[model samples]
Target: SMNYFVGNSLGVNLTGIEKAIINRLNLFKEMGRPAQCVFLSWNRYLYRNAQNYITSSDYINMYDFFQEATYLERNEPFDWLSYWTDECHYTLKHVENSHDFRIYDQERFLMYAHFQDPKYRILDYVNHFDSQRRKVKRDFYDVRGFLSCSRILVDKQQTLCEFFYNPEGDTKLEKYFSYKDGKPEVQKIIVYYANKQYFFNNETELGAFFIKQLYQHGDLFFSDRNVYTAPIFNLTPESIPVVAVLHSTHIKNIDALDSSPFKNVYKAMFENLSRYRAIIVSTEQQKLDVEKRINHTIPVVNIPVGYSTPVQTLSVKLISVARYSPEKQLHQQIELIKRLVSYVPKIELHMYGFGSESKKLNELIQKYGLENHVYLRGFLSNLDQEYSDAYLSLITSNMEGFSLALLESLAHGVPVISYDIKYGPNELITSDFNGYLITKNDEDALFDKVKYVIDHPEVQQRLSKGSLAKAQQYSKASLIKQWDQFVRLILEHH
Candidate 1:
């Protein structure tokens, strides 16, 4: 059976869910299954450097609806100065030589050239700025030296609209954005395809159209993001099964499971569970929880999102691989370090990942006078070295579906000490075995458990060995076997 993994986008910074998707795609290829990763969002630069995000092995199978609609080749070279005329070229030379032209107040308008490669000096796109030094417009070029798209901006950063063009420079698609409280939201989309103009109220409607054009009989789709998947499944034939993959906890409040409402992003998927042939969760406990909530009407399958390979640490170096977001409760880590410094003066906390809370986290470190003890390490492409050097890893998230970081820590034989919050930590940690699982939000418990591991080297060594053993259960080969069997069973039964 053909497999389609659908999602919103493979953004520049990949989270655990995106990493898991890439891992799953590679596994499918290993099983000799035909699979493709499809995205709905429009990222102008993604097609050129997608291999960096999805890897080169599965790069050929990566497809974006917007890229296809615009008729742009994946590997085509589109120079930056393709749209420049003789007059524009002369103007740039004059501006480069004349100091007065470089001044925003004197010129009132400026054109800045961007190159895809500075050494080769190949232009990619040109940004137009107003007197106040605010970006007003950006014009993108295609392989044929034709205008591909023009992005209009407002308030320096907010995108007003994007006009996509065909090879003949004809308007093909228009995407408009509306700002709500300083945040830009997609207002509507208009696509001109097959000699017909189609209007869509939102992204989901447009995504449904894209999916219908790509769908074929007997092909299976796994929805990685419900917002993009639910609408497509709702519009497609019922016989065509769509599998809903839960990457995060569905419950709004894990503490009050029964009374708490489902998270808004998941409500539509849960209400339309029958539309999905199967539901995939990260852990068996999560499967049970989901089945109980749905009255076991549909099958709930437990498949670890991705598996880690067992690999080959201990300077009292605690590391956390999490986004600096409020949901992650990263600020608490700073507070934890402030308390631990008295016991372990040399203890260092290095955090990896980036988000809006980075400045706040750094400020907190300064407030506690723990600059030398704490660090806000930005996102890294690989963390094998970080994991190897770490004595232990910490997780203080409000909730998790199945944390890839938790699995990575175990695979590296580095014990983890995470708050015993939702689905992942409890399933991965057998408390005082592989790692310590403290009560959720209990700062004292979190502090004590971390201190316990640091104070006792013998206990640390024991947990290290246990971590390696625990990780073996979720090794790549074992999980691939489960996936192969699961896929075969679904295709045969359906």
Candidate 2:
């Protein structure tokens, strides 16, 4: 507790970050096993500080101290007493502490993320401050932080920190150590969906992810300035380059927006765009929209979002995955069958998913007396199975990031057809082969596509086959390959 020492790490930074070690026979007095192992882990974390602070490498020289340390050889009998007689395996067993072989929890993974290769969690770091500043404020960092440390403080007596955390920074050293913030905008940010926060970012399943734990975990503050600040909180004490997804024409015609207040907020929120390494658009047209609106050639990358389809045999069942909301125009779908009851009565639309507007949608189905041709089902966990039996999936989102449902269904070999909007339709459907992207919000267009899909057996079969074939590319293995490529690219160029 001397003024010379800094604070201890909050969790178990002092205890959990190391293993036991052994030394050469010549250095028998100093090269103790477990004593040195702990020092090596410490050095790695405080490299910048240790290089300048203390003497003799400024930290433990566990490496030099135990350079002669070796493994348990096959020649040795497994006797504990005989092992510790300066023999190799005895030292190995001495270092076989359970803490050394502990599995990684969320917090541990995050601490590992600090020095591990291809650090993706955060892109910038500051000497002091809870809030990180960036090209634009963003909520991504807050969620990432929460995801990394998800559990609330539970038991107080057991001292489980050794299993899940490293608390070195909690010491006065972190408080007293001086470092300057050099601005981390140029740093590249690469995040993974190894957790749910990552899933929401990649999947754009906001209603499901953003709202799922809101009431319990605390609703997202969702401030534009706060979200903009994310690019600066590097997961490590370094900078991370960020790739921000511009979901919509951020600065949409202010006058055309729902209201002047919203337009002003959007404009204010977008003022921080100068900080990110790049802006990701869902489609080519979306990219164009951003360039035209911003009049700035920000590094815009077009990463088509959503699921892609695969090839498969056509089935008789039809499926549609969309929130029961206005933009999706799902209500019109219920009324469609009633209007065309005399024309296409044999066809049915099997609906899947949950949303706030469920009540409205259910009422509409009953009002139109189309209950026979259309069915409403709650959330389905095994969506792939549902899509497998489906003839085609529908795209009725008011807008979409990548419409995982649409692409997901296609990946399962179902064709898609709907009143196509801006981003998703362009990315997923090939038109005629796999699905149709109709004009947005037009009931007639949606109805026509629905009618055609039901009437044409050949088109359904062809699109199904094509959809499934394309779906193969989005499998975990394939996406992971892309992920690896993304990491390599960031490492080399970004």
Candidate 3:
């Protein structure tokens, strides 16, 4: 079995990727082939239980679904069969390691650095702080150290950001991020050498330095096609076979053509189309839209990530499973419930997942006195009971690549009420049928739809049927096969 890698900071927000990886591994198991679910993360402290964690079940989620999985913790050997970076920012990090790799693992941190002072002749130094006034782990070229980098924490070690000092006094910082409750955030780069100071609108801007360090050649490397990896392609080796999976719509305006197709995450990716093995979109509609934009064919393929089976027997309780962040519009969801409770006072809304928004969401819950009607259930390894028991599912996301919450909820025979956002909601939810797709950010429609489903039990019953019917088409078996064929095609050809 050749090693395959899916890189993401943490698994909290990527339930769809999680399901897809597990299903692939499961298929490999049934075939008596060796398959491993490998997660390559940039966060070193994310797994610790006592450190203001997102969820207790982070590692448990890995063990539950995967038989053999390894979080390519720190910098380990990844010269495996193939690699898939789960998001744009993640691809940026892994791409750098392809060139300037350091011997990093849970047990070690190894690198080389020459001191600026020629007379000193510093070969090795341990646990020392240079001119920066903060602790560092390198034979300092002073305040900043590279040729090397690592974080010296109180208890254990972690990589805050990898610092690379130029021949000049300038230092380059490569930062990492993870979700804290409902907040998914990355950190500021350690920029000391530049007296002018530095700021980046996004991680890509800071990660641009890695472009020069990109490996000119390597094994199969593909990106999960989030917004970040677009510009990165310009730096990758043209001879190497790198691909992009367009998980979300590429168009800025979904309803109109000629409405700035090169916007959002795909802007940079579209700029350099020649640098890919293939670009994959989850739906046929998305694929067509992508083709129309490029105005030519350059290996744009259609493949759904994976699918789920249907479940029966549901309750009246509402369940929402997604990352807690601003784009998710969870705040709007809480308000939606406040008004919904006015009509159906007994209705309950239970939210599952973690991120940076935990505190703000909690404050809102207390502010509205929604403690009894709404609950933040946090992240769970097995959402079977939550999805199975719920009579209805709700989503107010501003956007999505593949809305697994909608798929999983519908699979469990629970219809959905979601914002009619780009890509997923409309594809998965049959407006007013299997589920309701309220116009984007239209809070009134969301409230009314929730009210209708709760007030009219017959409509709920009809929609539940539709939801189950919709789910039948997304059987994990068929989607897994579609995925395996694609994976093998890329592996064998590239």
Candidate 4:
């Protein structure tokens, strides 16, 4: 039996992508579709807390729904594809030309992240080394190098695994592959610093090893950051359709258009999308932009990531839920709060979630001396009360794939005030109705509208009702109808 897989890396964090996977799969279960979520992680440290967090939530069992790409056993042949979330280096080894087996499996075994690369993978590293003696050492340049003492693991006539080891021959510190039925199967990875080892396991891990042989034709589906990197590897079997889901604004600095050519990773994917099956965009505007930019008819489809409904209530506190990333412009959120408190003396802002930027964000709050007015609440197991009590939710991003936060906020009958960015805010926020869209980078507009909502109770009540009404359009049942067709199409082709 074959099942369609939604791929992302190993992490249990409830980001939009992770939330989408959980919501979609649970919806799939309710819809009775034969689909599963797959994750690729290097070592235990990468996803330990996240898995624990996800497992703790009990919404979707990490073990039941997720398959680790690294530990997949190579026992049989089947079909598999990825639905991307964000960006990381883990694409895949494109060993399509096996019989023409030019033993330099750089096409298949090379890890784009194992060594950093700027221009190309594993070449021209002298510049990165000599050019980096006095720098922050933050650049990745890929220059291919030889793996020492490499050996293939096999059992009887069927190959089970293969890997590269150090000169001292330590299997514990290697990119070890386990195989079955003449294919590269699972990878056993050990993280020394984290003091953990992982064998990402599932029933179909080995089944995917023989995917090329099992199906004369195959395809690669991309949804996130490495979409540009997919065609470069040339890994999957021939005639394999490549499908993409454009989750964010495709143009770089889409709202600001500073770059002359308007380049981005998605541009690369567009350049190479001649044979792509579908370029799925979450909104019509994004689809229209892609059609205009590319100047040709690409097979773009409009499919929103599913949303769930929440109960409505009247509340007065303001809340913002987002990762602490620079692009999220949370510092702007801080400044807005500073300006807001002047108008509404009792107004309180609660910021939720954490990331690399958490420390700096906390520091800024202190620097402004607004700790009493603004609170860094961290990630909560549940945001039910936050949404229920929030007078308005905030989104201050430069861009978004689709604002899951906005969707959740509205579903809970809470109005949101967000920077008018491409894709999501426009789709979700009905100015003066459900929420307000602040001018991009316009602090005054945000402050003015937030104050307006707080000062006028009647306006807030009407908007809250509007938010609940808008959310109904995106209920899981409605969204799943679209996903059901997409998944069924993929499985039928498989």
Question: Using TM-score as the measure, which candidate wins?
Answer: 1
lDDT score for residue 297 of model 2:
43
TM-score of 2: 0.49
lDDT by residue for model 4 (1-494), tens? 22323344445445555655556557767787543444433222322334432332222112212221222212222111121112322344333422111111223322212322322233211111113232111111111132222333233333333232322333333335555675665455332223445442432332233233223333333434334233331344436554566656766657444333534646655666664556777887777777666664555667787676235455258888887788788898889877877667787788887889988888989998888888889877678767876888888887766766678778889888888878788888888879888888888887888888889989989999999888998887888788768655754654
RMSD of each: 5.5, 19.3, 14.3, 15.7
How do all the candidates rank in terms of TM-score, highest first? 1, 4, 3, 2
lDDT of 1 by residue, 1-494 (tens): 57888776666667565676778888888878887777666555555445564543343222234333333444345432323433244233323332212212233447766545543234456677876778899888542344568999887567899888755667878889988997778788888777788898777777777777667877788888886677667777677768888887777877776777887877888888888888888888888888888888788899998787323334479989987888899999999999999979989999998999999998999999999999899988788877776788889887765877778778899888888777888888888788888878999989988898888988888898999888888988998899988888877777
lDDT (Cα, tens digit) per residue for candidate 3, span 132-176: 434455333221121233333321343344444332324444445
| TM-score, every prediction | 0.77, 0.49, 0.57, 0.62
Off by over 4 Å in 3: 1-221, 225-241, 248-268, 309-315, 356-369, 484-494
Off by more than 4 A, model 1:
55-139, 142-146, 150-163, 166-202, 309-315, 325-380, 443-456
By lDDT, the best candidate is 1
Between the candidate structures 3 and 4, which one is better when assessed by TM-score?
4
Taken over the whole model, the C-alpha lDDT of each candidate is 0.75, 0.42, 0.58, 0.56
Pairs with backbone N, CA or C atoms under 3 Å apart (clashes), candidate 3: 180-355, 181-354, 181-355, 182-355, 182-356, 182-357, 183-355, 183-356, 183-357
lDDT of 2 by residue, 361-441 (tens): 778888877777788887776675566557667766666645556656776777887665656577667787677878777
TM-score of 1: 0.77
